[PDB]
Scaffold this active site. Sequence first.
Site: not given
Length: 849
Positions: A10, A19
């Site tokens: 991530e 994101d």
Amino acid sequence: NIFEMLRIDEGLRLKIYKDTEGYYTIGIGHLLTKSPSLNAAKSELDKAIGRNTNGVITKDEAEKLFNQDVDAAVRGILRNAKLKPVYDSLDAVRRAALINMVFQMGETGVAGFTNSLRMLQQKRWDEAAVNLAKSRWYNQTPNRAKRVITTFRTGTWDAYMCGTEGPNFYVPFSNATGVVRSPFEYPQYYLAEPWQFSMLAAYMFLLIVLGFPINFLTLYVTVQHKKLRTPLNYILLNLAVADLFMVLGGFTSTLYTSLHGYFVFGPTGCNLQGFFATLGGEIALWSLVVLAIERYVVVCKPMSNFRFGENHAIMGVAFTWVMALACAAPPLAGWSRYIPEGLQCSCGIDYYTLKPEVNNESFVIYMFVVHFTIPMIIIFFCYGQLVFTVKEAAAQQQESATTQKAEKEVTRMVIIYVIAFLICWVPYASVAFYIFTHQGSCFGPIFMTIPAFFAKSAAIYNPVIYIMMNKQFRNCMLTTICCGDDEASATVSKTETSVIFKKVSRDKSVTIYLGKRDYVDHVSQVEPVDGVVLVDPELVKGKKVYVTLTCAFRYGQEDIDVMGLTFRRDLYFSRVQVYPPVGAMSVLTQLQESLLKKLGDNTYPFLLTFPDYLPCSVMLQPAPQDVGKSCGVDFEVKAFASDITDPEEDKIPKKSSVRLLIRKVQHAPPEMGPQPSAEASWQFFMSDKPLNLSVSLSKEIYFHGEPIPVTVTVTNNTDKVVKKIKVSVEQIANVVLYSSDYYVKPVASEETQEKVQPNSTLTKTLVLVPLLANNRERRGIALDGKIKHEDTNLASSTIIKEGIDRTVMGILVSYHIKVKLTVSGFLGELTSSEVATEVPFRLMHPQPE
Ligand SMILES: *[C@@H]1O[C@H](CO)[C@@H](O[C@@H]2O[C@H](CO)[C@@H](O)[C@H](O)[C@H]2NC(C)=O)[C@H](O)[C@H]1NC(C)=O
């Protein structure tokens, strides 16, 4: 582990970021809110953290948000009917992989995979991996997916391993892209941008340009100048040689590799470069440790200067190489290893990679405790106690301004020594310890270059701080660039009767006169220095003529001891202004009256009194093989002319100055004390019967050359027999400078083989002859001060004035008679019990007519 999986995948973001899907996320995959307003996202963040963040948080707070997410993820899985049996069946490594899937997509997202979850439960690892690889999930982000898929297939952390681990090397880069190649064979430019290799090449070149001459000059100059050749400097010469191995072996090869971008010389070259860089660093380390130890012992205890010869210095330099090889050899021998570090152009010990074959685990602990922590404690202890001692000594004498400024220079340099040591070895100690504890976490090549900067930089500033800052070394190095007292070179003592003696200065402006060299020291008062000073009015015009009384405790050499961060301690110092006279002397002496009429109008009188807390003139005896070793207390009357005002003493003109050595001597007092009588009784554990002994002398005070009768009465009431009786004159030399130290060397002894049976007594008087002549060519014998090089007798017993405030600093001598008994041991004939008792006595000069 799980933390390192999701952190790398991530990515850890301290601020809020959108994101791949475009939702507001912070830290590691933590959804704040779905609200479109930017202020709403910060509000939902603020409540989560518990303060006003303004879109900025730390990593520990993010680690808390991650823990709540993992504790809840293990629930949403167990709660789900499809996920739980899979979770229970799969092992801890494959469970981490499943949590990664649930953490990213969610509970509803993972629930879409029916056949994948099914086969994993049935231990079909091959068929489920193809299932996940052909799905939409793989097509979306095959980077993340493939790491998770391989975990299911193998059941290992090979996918989530930090960097490429070769047999002969470790590169801190992932081979997932496939670009990773051997540092021995191919270029490493994929690690960092190519300009940083030429940057290192420029940096490593700079260390060769600065390092090689500085360290080479240290060795070159010492060969030229014999002055620098001293046992204490031997450890500083070892530092120069140590730093040269880093430059010659290490930096020169490291330069050539940083040129091309990779390690050209191969594993053979990597072993030798890593060896010399480690050795040269480790020698330099323990050199400063031994230096700290040597400087601590030598200065504090002046007796140790005598004991410290070439043997003790060699012992220090050898010890360094032993400890250096203790660090440097084992990687060669196979315990741990030498591999390219950082950008892999430079080879060093393997602190970062954990290899169980070579056991890096034990070696790093060995490094951290033996080769770091112990040098750190010793150096900080030695220099720490060194300042503590000087701070105590300067507090005693606040009158001497020279001792005060030294303490200032001491505290300065020690702080620099601390900073020099801390800047050097803490980066490695911090990083290697951090890597050992955080080994799950990943670190780049630049991370390992930052400690490598400071330790390689120490090859420059440690020579400068320890050598260039020292005054004796600094001065000699200047004379080398300069490529080269002598004029005058005259300092003689004359004599004339009218008995009086005088001495003329170098410039012959200031001429001093004195009545006698030996000044008699009484108990109550002291005989002051009386004399006059003839001043040349033409040469000395508008200047200030002074006279001094210098009582100095002298130990070791003038050059090196003054260089040693402090200098020889001036015990007592006094001053009087001679010319131009302020007022006049109220009363003159019979000597001053004669010399004033004898000499011209330009003569001026002076008088210098002594306090009651001073010692006598005493020097310790050197051996014949000992040449440069010198220690003892001595008094010096000096006179000089100077343009500068009264306070300046440390620096004066040599040409105008003139000096003459004098003595402060105690003759024996008229009252001889009571007849010395010592008595003692002795017993044993098994045998409780008594053994009485009574020692008796003739006089309390004795004279040099006078025989000393020791009457001994041995009364044997016990079961054992006395084999022999030995009487010994022992010289106590109590040295008080920075500390009180008693040293006992027997000056004379006589013994007898007369046996004493049980229930039988013996009276025997044995004479002893405490003379220097027999004790010549020995070490540590206390002597009376010799004017020039003339013959002198054993040191006189020093009498301290009764009831004084100040502690007497100096060499304080005392004598006693030790009657030693050798008795047969109860267990066996060979076994023996040595018993003895002491009685004090004085040995002093007789008072002349
Ligand atoms: C990192 O991956 C690359 C690419 O797979 C490796 O390079 C190959 O290594 C295999 C090992 O058997 C050789 O057979 C191939 O010939 C190599 N490929 C090429 C194009 O040369 C590489 O070895 C891995 N890293 C290291 C340093 O081992």
